[PDB]
Design an enzyme around this catalytic site. Structure first.
Site, PDB file in Angstrom:
ATOM      1  N   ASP A 173       7.807  -4.054   0.875  1.00  0.00           N
ATOM      2  CA  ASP A 173       7.537  -5.139   1.815  1.00  0.00           C
ATOM      3  C   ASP A 173       6.042  -5.262   2.098  1.00  0.00           C
ATOM      4  O   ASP A 173       5.609  -5.382   3.246  1.00  0.00           O
ATOM      5  CB  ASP A 173       8.336  -4.944   3.106  1.00  0.00           C
ATOM      6  CG  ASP A 173       9.835  -4.817   2.859  1.00  0.00           C
ATOM      7  OD1 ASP A 173      10.248  -3.884   2.142  1.00  0.00           O
ATOM      8  OD2 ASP A 173      10.610  -5.630   3.397  1.00  0.00           O
ATOM      9  N   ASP A 200      10.260  -7.271  -1.920  1.00  0.00           N
ATOM     10  CA  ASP A 200       9.519  -8.059  -0.934  1.00  0.00           C
ATOM     11  C   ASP A 200       8.027  -7.920  -1.207  1.00  0.00           C
ATOM     12  O   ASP A 200       7.298  -7.218  -0.492  1.00  0.00           O
ATOM     13  CB  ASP A 200       9.899  -7.682   0.503  1.00  0.00           C
ATOM     14  CG  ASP A 200      11.265  -8.201   0.909  1.00  0.00           C
ATOM     15  OD1 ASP A 200      11.930  -8.905   0.108  1.00  0.00           O
ATOM     16  OD2 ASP A 200      11.671  -7.891   2.048  1.00  0.00           O
ATOM     17  N   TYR A 203       5.607 -12.304  -0.278  1.00  0.00           N
ATOM     18  CA  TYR A 203       5.964 -13.148   0.865  1.00  0.00           C
ATOM     19  C   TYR A 203       5.464 -14.583   0.697  1.00  0.00           C
ATOM     20  O   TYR A 203       5.107 -15.261   1.666  1.00  0.00           O
ATOM     21  CB  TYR A 203       5.539 -12.520   2.194  1.00  0.00           C
ATOM     22  CG  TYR A 203       6.421 -11.361   2.585  1.00  0.00           C
ATOM     23  CD1 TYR A 203       6.285 -10.129   1.965  1.00  0.00           C
ATOM     24  CD2 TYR A 203       7.396 -11.498   3.567  1.00  0.00           C
ATOM     25  CE1 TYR A 203       7.095  -9.073   2.302  1.00  0.00           C
ATOM     26  CE2 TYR A 203       8.210 -10.431   3.919  1.00  0.00           C
ATOM     27  CZ  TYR A 203       8.047  -9.231   3.281  1.00  0.00           C
ATOM     28  OH  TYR A 203       8.845  -8.161   3.617  1.00  0.00           O
ATOM     29  N   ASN A 257      14.972  -9.574  -0.952  1.00  0.00           N
ATOM     30  CA  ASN A 257      15.446 -10.907  -0.587  1.00  0.00           C
ATOM     31  C   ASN A 257      14.333 -11.944  -0.608  1.00  0.00           C
ATOM     32  O   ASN A 257      14.611 -13.133  -0.795  1.00  0.00           O
ATOM     33  CB  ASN A 257      16.144 -10.901   0.775  1.00  0.00           C
ATOM     34  CG  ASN A 257      15.321 -10.221   1.853  1.00  0.00           C
ATOM     35  OD1 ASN A 257      14.958  -9.063   1.722  1.00  0.00           O
ATOM     36  ND2 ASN A 257      15.027 -10.941   2.926  1.00  0.00           N
ATOM     37  N   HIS A 339      16.446  -2.340  -2.491  1.00  0.00           N
ATOM     38  CA  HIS A 339      15.729  -2.984  -1.398  1.00  0.00           C
ATOM     39  C   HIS A 339      16.290  -2.609  -0.026  1.00  0.00           C
ATOM     40  O   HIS A 339      15.528  -2.251   0.875  1.00  0.00           O
ATOM     41  CB  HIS A 339      15.680  -4.499  -1.554  1.00  0.00           C
ATOM     42  CG  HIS A 339      14.814  -5.153  -0.523  1.00  0.00           C
ATOM     43  ND1 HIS A 339      13.468  -4.872  -0.402  1.00  0.00           N
ATOM     44  CD2 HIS A 339      15.100  -6.054   0.445  1.00  0.00           C
ATOM     45  CE1 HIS A 339      12.966  -5.563   0.605  1.00  0.00           C
ATOM     46  NE2 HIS A 339      13.932  -6.303   1.125  1.00  0.00           N
ATOM     47  N   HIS A 349      18.509  -5.898  10.607  1.00  0.00           N
ATOM     48  CA  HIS A 349      19.278  -5.626   9.394  1.00  0.00           C
ATOM     49  C   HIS A 349      20.225  -4.442   9.539  1.00  0.00           C
ATOM     50  O   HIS A 349      20.610  -3.828   8.540  1.00  0.00           O
ATOM     51  CB  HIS A 349      18.376  -5.443   8.173  1.00  0.00           C
ATOM     52  CG  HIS A 349      17.320  -6.490   8.049  1.00  0.00           C
ATOM     53  ND1 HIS A 349      17.613  -7.827   7.874  1.00  0.00           N
ATOM     54  CD2 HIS A 349      15.970  -6.399   8.082  1.00  0.00           C
ATOM     55  CE1 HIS A 349      16.488  -8.512   7.801  1.00  0.00           C
ATOM     56  NE2 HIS A 349      15.476  -7.669   7.923  1.00  0.00           N
ATOM     57  N   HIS A 376      12.761  -3.208   3.153  1.00  0.00           N
ATOM     58  CA  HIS A 376      13.500  -4.219   3.918  1.00  0.00           C
ATOM     59  C   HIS A 376      13.275  -4.147   5.427  1.00  0.00           C
ATOM     60  O   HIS A 376      12.941  -5.156   6.053  1.00  0.00           O
ATOM     61  CB  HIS A 376      14.992  -4.170   3.569  1.00  0.00           C
ATOM     62  CG  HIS A 376      15.773  -5.373   3.994  1.00  0.00           C
ATOM     63  ND1 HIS A 376      15.320  -6.665   3.826  1.00  0.00           N
ATOM     64  CD2 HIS A 376      17.007  -5.476   4.542  1.00  0.00           C
ATOM     65  CE1 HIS A 376      16.236  -7.509   4.268  1.00  0.00           C
ATOM     66  NE2 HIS A 376      17.269  -6.813   4.709  1.00  0.00           N
ATOM     67  N   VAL A 377      13.470  -2.986   6.024  1.00  0.00           N
ATOM     68  CA  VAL A 377      13.271  -2.807   7.456  1.00  0.00           C
ATOM     69  C   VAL A 377      11.805  -2.459   7.699  1.00  0.00           C
ATOM     70  O   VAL A 377      11.263  -1.551   7.058  1.00  0.00           O
ATOM     71  CB  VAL A 377      14.212  -1.717   7.989  1.00  0.00           C
ATOM     72  CG1 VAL A 377      13.845  -1.354   9.428  1.00  0.00           C
ATOM     73  CG2 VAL A 377      15.677  -2.191   7.887  1.00  0.00           C
ATOM     74  N   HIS A 378      11.152  -3.190   8.605  1.00  0.00           N
ATOM     75  CA  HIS A 378       9.702  -3.063   8.788  1.00  0.00           C
ATOM     76  C   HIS A 378       9.391  -1.926   9.757  1.00  0.00           C
ATOM     77  O   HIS A 378       8.965  -2.122  10.894  1.00  0.00           O
ATOM     78  CB  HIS A 378       9.109  -4.383   9.251  1.00  0.00           C
ATOM     79  CG  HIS A 378       9.380  -5.506   8.310  1.00  0.00           C
ATOM     80  ND1 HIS A 378       9.414  -6.825   8.709  1.00  0.00           N
ATOM     81  CD2 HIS A 378       9.641  -5.505   6.983  1.00  0.00           C
ATOM     82  CE1 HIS A 378       9.692  -7.586   7.666  1.00  0.00           C
ATOM     83  NE2 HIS A 378       9.830  -6.812   6.606  1.00  0.00           N
TER      84      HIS A 378
HETATM   85 FE   LIG Z   1      13.789  -7.513   2.709  1.00  0.00          FE
END
Ligand SMILES: [Fe+3]
Ligand SMILES: *[C@@H]1O[C@H](CO)[C@@H](O[C@@H]2O[C@H](CO)[C@@H](O)[C@H](O)[C@H]2NC(C)=O)[C@H](O)[C@H]1NC(C)=O
Ligand SMILES: *[C@@H]1O[C@H](CO)[C@@H](O)[C@H](O)[C@H]1NC(C)=O
Ligand SMILES: *[C@@H]1O[C@H](CO)[C@@H](O)[C@H](O)[C@H]1NC(C)=O
Ligand SMILES: *[C@@H]1O[C@H](CO)[C@@H](O)[C@H](O)[C@H]1NC(C)=O
Ligand SMILES: *[C@@H]1O[C@H](CO)[C@@H](O)[C@H](O)[C@H]1NC(C)=O
Ligand SMILES: *[C@@H]1O[C@H](CO)[C@@H](O)[C@H](O)[C@H]1NC(C)=O
Ligand SMILES: *[C@@H]1O[C@H](CO)[C@@H](O)[C@H](O)[C@H]1NC(C)=O
Length: 507
Positions: A173, A200, A203, A257, A339, A349, A376-378
């Site tokens: 990400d 990711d 962006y 995603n 991911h 999520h 995925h998770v920030h």
């Molecule tokens: Fe993601």
């Protein structure tokens, strides 16, 4: 530092810092994202591994992209794909040729702008010695000035139970903000031999086709646009910014995603599938979305959270065959990346990928998967060894590093925070569909969708940007270290664990 041999540790949550706003995207005026070559000279040069250490991919783009107006896709056959390489910078006596392609991003809606890429090239170098530095130049030697400068990379060490890459960086990400530059600078200073990027990437889909960006597409444009738009030049900016890393260090990418990027005719993943090299043919996945490769005595599997993962599907059948071929006396370590985390405890999520866990977790456990990396998770999170929501000395360690620094908000709220448990029906991933996230039937949270405190399977969680380094030492021991961006002093470590595998116990 703890060891997994000690069993699970009591959960730790690092207190939040005061929010200082979102990360700021690099502007298109940043010298590092501007076109620094002319004509057909190579840009965005990147190395990727093949399935075995004895081969590697070199990729690059020639020619500027087109954005807006009546775009005219380039003919990829007009610029050749050549790599000259060798063991010394002054003796590039070996040659390989490859393939070229373009992609476009087309929207059939009035007011939206179209994009088409430069020519992308992918060349596989064969017959490489493992653990060895190769010098290379890429481009088209028949066009004056169309060859790159000399670059160099080191192949992965030979496959065996005592032979490992020194340092493997793991990020997810990233996006392309000033905070991303901090992540990448921290990572590069640790001199990794290999970079894993867990989805990711750029962006680009936080932008409209006219270049206007936002920290949250759903918040800003979900109702006022006819499709989830992208600004494809963000990919080119990302590739240009990353070139000092990718031209010297192999980088393996798997899709997230934000790579969906739906366009005309329901086409998806065009940029992701075109831009990177993947060992799809060599590992027999024949998909850009999942694949495997060996790096020393580590067998890596990159799985697709965004391609059919059901037990009846192609990916699952490929995975069964891939696992059956692994010889744990040759590659003792079995490590996976994909991911979407299966054991994240953040509200964002939460349990979103439950259907993927239910489909694939037992198969992976039955083959002794050692470690899972996700994005995925920030935020940063590390699990205790866990299988099917049960602390288990033979379960994998799940580590989530989707904290690469993109401009979307940091994940700060936990599902177990008072009053923050999401409604179950709101949680499943919409792109993939299905619902698999039922309330627990045993353990401390029996009867509920969430715990009321940090779950015991969560060893460590912190809402900071950063990256991790995996140092596999031998067939039973590996050291994991995660580094937070806000620490810049020499040797700073945010989280560390010795991961000890016990094959006689678990295989
Ligand atoms: Fe993601
Ligand atoms: C496998 O690697 C681990 C970690 O490097 C080795 O463990 C270390 O061994 C030395 C000598 O006994 C100790 O001083 C360290 O404290 C150990 N570290 C840990 C975390 O235990 C281990 O010896 C290696 N096993 C082999 C080569 O068979
Ligand atoms: C963008 O491409 C689509 C598909 O070819 C086309 O329908 C559309 O008119 C194009 N838009 C512009 C401004 O050229
Ligand atoms: C992102 O970078 C900015 C500017 O350097 C910094 O102020 C901010 O604290 C960083 N954000 C996080 C979550 O570290
Ligand atoms: C892009 O289009 C949106 C509306 O669709 C508009 O609000 C925004 O200001 C536009 N940005 C530019 C640079 O035109
Ligand atoms: C559209 O594209 C996605 C991704 O391939 C797919 O999952 C979906 O089923 C497709 N929808 C239609 C109507 O074809
Ligand atoms: C996981 O736990 C649930 C509930 O206890 C159980 O029904 C299910 O069969 C388990 N899955 C596997 C692969 O063991
Ligand atoms: C599941 O747990 C939630 C609270 O987390 C509760 O509101 C909900 O009613 C439960 N559903 C079932 C079927 O038990």
């Amino acid at each position: 530092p703890a060891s997994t041999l000690e069993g699970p540790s009591r959960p730790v949550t690092v207190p939040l810092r005061e929010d200082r706003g979102h990360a700021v995207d690099l502007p298109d005026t940043d010298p590092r994202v501007q076109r620094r070559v002319t004509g057909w000279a190579p840009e965005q040069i990147a190395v990727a591994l093949s399935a075995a250490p004895t081969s590697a991919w070199v990729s690059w783009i020639t020619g500027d992209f087109q954005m807006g107006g009546a775009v005219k896709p380039l003919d990829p056959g007009t610029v050749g794909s050549v790599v000259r390489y060798g063991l010394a910078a002054d003796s590039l006596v070996r040659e390989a040729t490859g393939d070229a392609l373009v992609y476009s991003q087309l929207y059939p809606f009035e007011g939206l702008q179209n994009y088409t890429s430069g020519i992308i090239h992918h060349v596989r170098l064969q017959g490489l010695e493992p653990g060895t530095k190769y010098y290379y130049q890429c481009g088209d030697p028949s066009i004056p000035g169309a060859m790159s400068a000399v670059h160099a990379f080191r192949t992965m060490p030979a496959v065996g139970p005592r032979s490992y890459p020194g340092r493997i960086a793991v990020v997810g990400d990233l996006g392309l903000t000033y905070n991303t530059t901090s992540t990448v600078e921290h990572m590069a200073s640790n001199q990794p031999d290999l970079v894993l990027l867990l989805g990711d990437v750029s962006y680009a889909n936080l932008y409209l086709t006219n270049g206007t960006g936002t920290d949250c597409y759903s918040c800003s444009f979900a109702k006022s646009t006819p499709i989830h738009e992208t600004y494809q030049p963000r990919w080119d900016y990302w590739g240009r910014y990353m070139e000092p890393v990718t031209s010297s260090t192999p980088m393996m990418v798997v899709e997230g995603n934000h790579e969906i990027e739906q366009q005309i005719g329901n086409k998806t993943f065009a940029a992701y599938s075109a831009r990177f090299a993947f060992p799809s043919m060599e590992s027999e996945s024949f998909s850009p979305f999942y694949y495997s490769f060996d790096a020393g005595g580590i067998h890596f599997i990159m799985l697709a959270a965004y391609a059919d993962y059901s037990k009846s599907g192609e990916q699952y059948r490929w995975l069964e065959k891939d696992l059956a071929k692994v010889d744990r006396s040759v590659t003792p370590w079995l490590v996976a990346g994909w991911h979407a985390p299966w054991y994240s405890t953040y509200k964002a999520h939460y349990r979103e990928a439950e259907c993927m866990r239910v489909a694939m977790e037992e198969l992976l456990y039955s083959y002794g998967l050692d470690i899972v990396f996700t994005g995925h998770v920030h935020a940063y999170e590390r699990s205790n060894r866990v299988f099917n929501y049960t602390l288990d000395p033979c379960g994998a360690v799940h580590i989530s590093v989707g904290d690469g620094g993109n401009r979307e908000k940091m994940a700060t709220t936990h599902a177990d925070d008072p009053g923050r448990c999401p409604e179950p029906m709101s949680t499943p991933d919409a792109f993939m569909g299905g619902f698999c996230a039922f309330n627990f039937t045993s353990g401390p949270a029996a009867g509920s969708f969430c715990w009321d405190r940090q779950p015991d399977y969560s060893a460590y969680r912190e809402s900071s940007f950063g990256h991790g380094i995996l140092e596999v030492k031998n067939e039973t021991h590996a050291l994991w270290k995660w580094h937070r961006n806000q620490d810049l002093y020499q040797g700073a470590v945010g989280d560390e664990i010795y991961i000890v595998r016990e094959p006689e116990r678990c295989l």
